Design a protein around this nucleic acid. Structure first.
Lengths: 34, 384, 63, 46, 233, 76, 146, 365, 220
RNA sequence: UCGA
């Protein structure tokens, strides 16, 4: 259901914790917002 | 002896994403400083202006294994958010490669068709012969000559016409490309088809994105490694150097100034919120006109344009303030100021223009300190 | 309840948990981080960490 | 490391024991219990 | 004076045409000092024979191609450039290549005059279409380095003469690089990796020895001034 | 076949090691637990499978064992 | 520097292999070109050109009518010896027209040869490779702080 | 020097750093000639800390005053008045930079000015009263020391001014090849140089002190600080610039300070710089040096460090400082005198014993 | 091939520096060959430099000597400009003693047997009636640049003051190439080199030291 | 209180 692992370019492994990855994916660019 | 194949973890605070921590193989180096790979800088967001980094040493076998497989630098070349390659040639490597792939009209050794008693004479036998012609003053890297290639791979569609049975494992062929585009295609793996393009950071992102998907990770690690060596090598030869002479001023501004300032001076007769807006809307076009006229004035070979036009660094708006005019600058409140900055950093700013410039410059610098604080609070809520 | 205690409003989270006599199953990873356990993710999943490794008899014969 | 042996299995961070004792000072009865049976003691008290 | 220790030279062979050589250790930063001089010496300093011009029968004012062969004039030009031939003449020697009818021409089809020899008889010069004829005259002369196409007006006056870019030195390709090796407590001593690809005229080992011989004799004129003291072997 | 003979810590490549196990995490416990065994051999007890280096970290030996399909593992 | 340019020392090359003028005089610091345009501090280039102008002596021909570039020119500054100190007050400084005209000046490097053109760029020689760099590069004397 | 002229809003009777809003940090139009808008910290303290301007001075009530040249009827006057805020708005301020005829007056028909807004305005000589004494009235000492300041953005200018106070005294400090004339004045007013207060002739010159013989008959001497440790660990060493039989004048420099050359502020060196990318070794702000700077010490600096320990009466006895350290190899104490301290001039390394001491213990067990 | 044995003919400009020219050379050989000698000149020419110094009154470098205008650090920074030449491999010590008022120059040192000072005009220190300077310096043999060798790593005692030792006779070396001729006509690349010494040795001795240096290095 |  999730999808392809963005870093791997392949399917998501059974161990990936995507909540923290998504939180960092949204939070890191937050310095560029106005 | 103990350092051998014993990984270490490097950290650069603040750590925004997981790529802020990466594993490396240590190399004993003299001095008290740390040597960091130039490609991983985009991940750490680490400037070389004096940044400090931390090192941690894994101990148990499980820890060492997680550093070699999971956290190795070569293993993660892609941003685990958007998917775009995070470690790719940037800055010097961009302009370094953008210089090689470019083809200059009428360069030295340019190939021309055969006419009457003169054969073609422009082509070369092998790429190794092109080097012999380059060392001597005959051949130029940016020339339009065509060569016969054996080991390199031709484009797919053009490959099937030259060869019906298969690819060119050891079989020769010919095409018309600049020598810089031939040497660039030597860095890529043999299986990849010819590109024949001038390297832009957007295009180089399309190619690296294509290698990560098609080829193995190791092949991508070595290809990006070979790209940074050529990007740095030809960055020195790029002829890109800053001087007061290369930066220049377009004349059209004074006319636009004559036009705007005087046609806005005619607006002063009517003189309220729209009056200033009428001058702002008018002065807003003067900045665009100067930048548009500046882009037309500057030749392509000049270094400042080659930068930011190849995607290495910078933007056109920054060059709009350097030469021409910096334009209107906001006041303490969100309201624009009708009086623009007519001077350019090249021509120098008047005493008064500097005072009103710090109004917006400091307010934006105070915003930088605040935005990083609220984003960190937002990130902790997302994680939890 | 200790994951919310470590997050925000520690005082309010604690009084509510103690009044309800709450019990924390120590499921999430933030709990395992605080107690020094293996987080239930990545290599810490109940499957990976229990992997058994043995050399194949065919390969052991070579030695 | 000095003996060349393997790294042993980790224990409980000391700050966590301090955390339990701090909670007990607030008059909050805290117990770490096994899945089966009843609670256990990190030390003299828990 | 000077005293140094343990410069060495080793040989790793990639193929018959190219091999790798290493020198360890070099006192910093001698690796970069003499590296580019070796590359320059191997490329342009070694004598060899090549073809300075050719003349194919039947082609005079033609822009390109030729009747009776699938090879265009250009492809044959660079097909003939890859001809590895060593001559003892030191003066221009004229050769001749002739054939007719259906077939494919090789390097062994040409009759080499006494004193010159072709080392690649299996090389592909061209292919002759059915009911076609091909005759070509060649000019082979010795030289050093790489001299491009030359217009001397003697080639320009002759209606047919076609000068070709001459590849003289048998060494085709040479690259180098330096690294850092710790000989003792002193760190970052220089090593020199040099790669050389040549052709059957001479081997890479003999090309290196010849290149080193011309260099030592090239710096010999400066040493003759005093001979006070120099870095030890 | 595009390796260019990788040098250290990257050898063997991860891709050829990933075909030998479920995921990258299964590969970690795979090689890690074997490194525990090899170091126990020098003091489960079952030698090295591949000819070791002069002085080779037990983990690097275990990775080369997995590379040649010399080990078996079962997930829990 | 004094303009806000900052950076650590990535390496120190021996004096033998370093970009050097035809003088045989090696340079001292090598600054990355990519950092100058983006940061919006161009004054460092100005003091780098003027730094070279003041280092070597400079003499204005002036002829009979004087160059118009000097109409608002500096007073009795036309001449100046080698290694001369110059002052450029902030908002009463050495302007752009004067800098270009000041680049034309005396450059007797032990002999008659001048080592910097009117555009402020010189042809450097790579000491490591042994061949000159393909394009002219900007050289001069800047003021840096530890 | 910059520290002494600093202006900070934080403190008792003032706002806290978190309590301070963004309204104070923005430069006010009344900061012209009073507080330097460029110079300030880049950390959490932006806008709260500032540097007092050059020509400004404080009132008895505490309101900053700025000098101005009164101009009446379109003719600049020799009169100068110190105006402060409210009084500055009641007049229009001419631009310091303006055309000036030989005899003196407003040469151009239309002249610049700044009104009570403050808002810039283009008026005629009829309505002008006050005029700036000169440019740089606003910028402070550190800011005024940057050549070609008008060509740099306020951001990098703020970094350049802040990093100037972050420099370090070198062994031989040489004045800047190209630089504004502020280095001369600012150097003698910092107090770290030596100034002659009476015209006369030098009687004696030495590294330890210099003696001057005034023309009135008196004899003054000045002791030179020699390799004194600065508060932050730098060296304050001073050197005499005068010859024995020379002649000085009131206010003339005598001995240079930690960072000075012949009476001017020398914060660094003049280097030959070629601007080009060099094989990746200078990448993204990195810099490469010529080994000459190491061999010739041009960038070498001296750093002094102070260590301290005391022998205190303890509960179980008295602490004794001596060479009698209980457990050590006699080889490690070779550099100590009988008292147990380190010998002057001797070398040391991390782990060496600078001062041996002892404390009683019990029970041993 | 064309047969012309490349011949080198020396020139002179001053005593410290003298030009050299080599002809003929194949095209493109002037740049790399002139640099191969330049780098060797700037590096391996032996010295002929001073290692450590010793002064009776000072136990370290950070103190001032009474009656002199300079300090020990500033005096050592002046002593770095010394150009000395020694024929002895083993170290030797010179001596300098100057009392009373005056200016101590580089000629006031009494050199041992076999050593000499090539710039007596160098300024060291200036003293007065109370000023007295007694200093001995150790001259050694070497090449290139070596930093100060600390006495803790050596066997020296507290008095000896190590100093940065620079062994090099050469000062400024450059070159230039004139390919000349024309596009055709077998254009010969010839290089005209400029070598300058410090007076420790003549430009011929240096170019012979550099020339003979790489002669033994090249091998196959 | 300063450095990124």
């Amino acid at each position: 259901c999730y999808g392809r692992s963005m870093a791997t370019g392949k399917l998501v492994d059974i161990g990936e914790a995507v909540g923290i990855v998504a939180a960092q994916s949204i939070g890191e660019p937050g310095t560029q917002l106005t | 002896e103990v350092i051998a194949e014993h990984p270490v973890l490097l950290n650069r605070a603040p750590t925004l994403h997981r790529l802020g921590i990466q594993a490396f193989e240590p190399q004993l180096v003299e001095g008290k400083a740390i040597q960091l790979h130039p490609l991983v800088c985009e991940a750490f967001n680490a400037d070389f202006d004096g940044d400090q980094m931390a090192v941690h040493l894994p101990l148990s076998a499980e820890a060492q294994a997680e550093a070699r497989i999971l956290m190795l630098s070569s293993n993660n070349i892609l941003s685990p958010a958007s998917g775009k390659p995070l470690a790719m040639p940037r800055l010097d490597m961009v302009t370094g490669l953008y210089y090689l792939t470019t083809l200059v009209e009428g360069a030295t050794g340019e190939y021309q068709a055969a006419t009457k008693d003169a054969p073609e004479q422009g082509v070369y036998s092998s790429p190794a012969e092109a080097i012999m012609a380059m060392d001597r003053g005959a051949l130029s890297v940016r020339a339009k000559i065509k060569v016969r290639l054996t080991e390199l791979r031709p484009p797919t569609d053009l490959e099937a016409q030259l060869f019906e049975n298969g690819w060119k494992p050891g079989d020769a062929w010919t095409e018309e490309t600049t020598l810089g585009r031939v040497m660039f295609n030597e860095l890529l793996p043999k299986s990849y088809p010819f590109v024949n393009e001038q390297m832009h950071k957007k295009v180089q992102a399309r190619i690296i994105n294509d290698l990560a998907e098609r080829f193995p990770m190791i092949v991508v690690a070595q290809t990006v490694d070979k790209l940074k060596d050529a990007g740095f090598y030809w960055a020195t030869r790029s002829g890109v150097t800053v001087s007061m002479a290369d930066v220049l001023v377009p004349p059209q501004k004074q006319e636009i100034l004559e036009r705007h300032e005087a046609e806005a001076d005619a607006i002063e007769r009517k003189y309220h919120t729209e009056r200033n807006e009428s001058l702002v809307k008018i002065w807003q076009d003067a900045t665009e006109e100067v930048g548009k006229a500046l882009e037309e004035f500057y030749p392509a070979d000049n270094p400042i344009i080659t930068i930011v036009k190849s995607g290495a660094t910078g933007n056109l708006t920054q060059t709009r303030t350097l030469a021409g005019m910096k334009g209107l600058v906001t006041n303490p409140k969100g309201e624009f100021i009708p009086r623009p900055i007519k001077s350019s950093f090249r021509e120098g700013l008047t005493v008064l223009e500097y005072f009103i410039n710090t109004h917006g410059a400091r307010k934006g610098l105070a915003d930088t300190a605040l935005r990083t604080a609220d984003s960190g609070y937002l990130t902790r809520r997302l994680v939890d | 309840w200790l994951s919310a205690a470590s997050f925000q409003e520690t005082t309010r989270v604690l009084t509510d948990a103690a009044i309800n006599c709450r019990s924390d199953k120590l499921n999430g990873l933030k709990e395992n981080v605080i107690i020094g356990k293996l987080i239930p993710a990545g290599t810490g999943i109940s499957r990976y960490r229990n992997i058994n490794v043995q050399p194949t008899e065919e390969a052991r014969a070579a030695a | 490391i000095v003996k060349g042996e393997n790294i042993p299995e980790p224990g409980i961070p000391e700050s966590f024991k301090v955390l339990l004792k701090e909670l007990q000072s607030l008059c909050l009865n805290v117990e770490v219990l096994s899945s089966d049976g009843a609670a256990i003691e990190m030390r003299d008290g828990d | 004076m000077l005293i140094s220790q343990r410069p060495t030279l080793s040989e790793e062979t990639v193929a018959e045409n190219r091999s790798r050589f290493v020198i360890e250790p070099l006192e910093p930063g001698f690796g970069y000092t003499l590296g580019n001089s070796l590359r320059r010496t191997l490329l342009s300093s070694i004598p060899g024979a090549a073809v300075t011009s050719i003349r194919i029968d039947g082609v005079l004012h033609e822009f390109t191609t030729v009747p009776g062969v699938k090879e265009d004039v250009t492809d044959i030009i660079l097909n003939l450039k890859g001809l590895v031939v060593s001559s003892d003449d030191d003066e221009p020697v004229t050769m001749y290549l002739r054939k007719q009818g259906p077939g494919v021409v090789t390097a062994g089809d040409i009759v080499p005059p006494a004193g010159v020899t072709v080392h690649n008889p299996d090389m592909h010069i061209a292919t002759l279409n059915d009911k076609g004829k091909l005759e070509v005259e060649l000019v082979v002369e010795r030289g050093r380095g790489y001299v491009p196409a030359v217009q001397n007006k003697a080639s320009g006056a002759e209606i047919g003469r076609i000068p070709v870019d001459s590849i003289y030195s048998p060494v085709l390709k040479v690259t180098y690089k330096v690294e850092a090796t710790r000989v003792e407590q002193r760190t970052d001593f220089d090593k020199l990796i040099i790669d050389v690809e040549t052709k059957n005229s001479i081997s890479p080992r003999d090309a290196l020895a010849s290149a080193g011989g011309t260099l030592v004799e090239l710096f010999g004129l400066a040493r003759e001034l005093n001979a006070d003291s120099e870095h030890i072997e | 076949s595009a390796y260019d003979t990788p040098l250290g810590i990257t050898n063997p490549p991860i891709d050829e090691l990933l075909s030998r196990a479920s995921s990258k995490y299964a590969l970690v416990i795979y090689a890690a637990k074997r490194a525990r065994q090899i170091n126990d051999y020098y003091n489960e007890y079952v030698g090295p499978l591949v000819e070791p280096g002069l002085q080779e970290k037990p983990l690097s030996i275990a990775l080369r064992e997995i590379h040649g399909d010399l080990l078996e593992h079962t997930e829990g | 520097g004094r303009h806000g340019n900052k950076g650590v020392i990535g390496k120190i090359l021996p004096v033998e292999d370093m970009p050097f003028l035809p003088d045989g005089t090696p340079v001292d610091i090598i600054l990355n070109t990519h950092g100058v345009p983006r940061r919006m501090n161009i004054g460092q280039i100005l003091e780098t050109h003027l730094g070279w102008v003041a280092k070597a002596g400079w003499n204005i021909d002036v002829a009979a009518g004087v160059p118009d570039w000097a109409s608002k020119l500096p007073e009795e500054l036309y001449s100046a010896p080698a290694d001369s100190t110059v002052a450029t007050p902030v908002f009463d400084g050495a302007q752009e027209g004067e800098l270009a005209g000041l680049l034309g000046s005396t450059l007797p490097n032990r002999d008659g040869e001048v080592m910097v053109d009117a555009d402020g760029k010189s042809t450097l020689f790579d000491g490591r490779s042994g061949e000159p760099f393909p394009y002219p590069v900007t050289v001069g004397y800047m003021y840096i702080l530890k | 020097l910059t520290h002494k002229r600093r202006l900070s809003a934080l403190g008792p009777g003032g706002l806290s750093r978190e309590r301070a809003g963004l309204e104070v940090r923005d430069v006010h139009p009344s900061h012209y000639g009073r507080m330097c808008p460029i110079e300030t910290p880049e950390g959490p303290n932006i806008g709260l800390i500032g540097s007092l301007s050059v020509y400004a001075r404080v009132n008895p009530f505490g309101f900053i005053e700025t000098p101005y040249r009164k101009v009446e009827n379109g003719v600049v006057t020799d009169q100068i008045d110190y105006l402060t805020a409210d009084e500055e708005d009641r007049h229009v301020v001419a631009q310091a930079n303006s055309p000036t005829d030989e005899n003196g007056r407003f040469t151009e028909d239309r002249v610049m000015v700044r009104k009570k807004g403050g808002e810039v305005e283009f008026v005629s000589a009829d309505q002008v009263d006050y005029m700036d004494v000169s440019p740089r009235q606003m910028v402070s000492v550190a800011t005024a020391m940057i050549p070609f300041l008008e060509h740099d953005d306020a951001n990098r200018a703020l970094m350049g001014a802040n990093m100037q106070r972050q420099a370090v005294p070198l062994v031989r400090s040489e004045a800047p090849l190209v630089g504004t004339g502020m280095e001369l004045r600012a150097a003698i007013d910092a107090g770290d140089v030596v100034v002659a207060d009476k015209t006369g002739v030098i009687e004696e010159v030495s590294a330890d002190y210099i003696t001057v013989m005034a023309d009135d008959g008196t004899r003054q001497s000045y002791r030179l600080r020699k390799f004194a440790r600065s508060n932050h660990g730098t060296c304050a060493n001073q050197r005499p610039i005068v010859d024995a039989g020379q002649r000085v004048e009131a206010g003339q420099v005598i001995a240079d300070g930690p960072c000075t050359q012949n009476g001017e502020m020398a914060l660094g060196k003049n280097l030959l710089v070629a601007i080009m990318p060099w094989e990746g070794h200078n990448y993204e702000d990195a810099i490469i040096l010529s080994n000459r700077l190491v061999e010739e010490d041009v960038l070498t600096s001296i750093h002094i460090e102070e260590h301290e320990i005391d022998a205190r009466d303890t509960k179980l006895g008295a602490e004794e400082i001596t060479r009698d350290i209980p457990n050590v190899s006699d080889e490690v104490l070779a550099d100590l005198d009988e008292r147990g301290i380190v010998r002057i001039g001797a070398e040391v390394r991390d782990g060496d014993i600078l001062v041996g001491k002892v404390t009683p213990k019990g029970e041993t067990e």
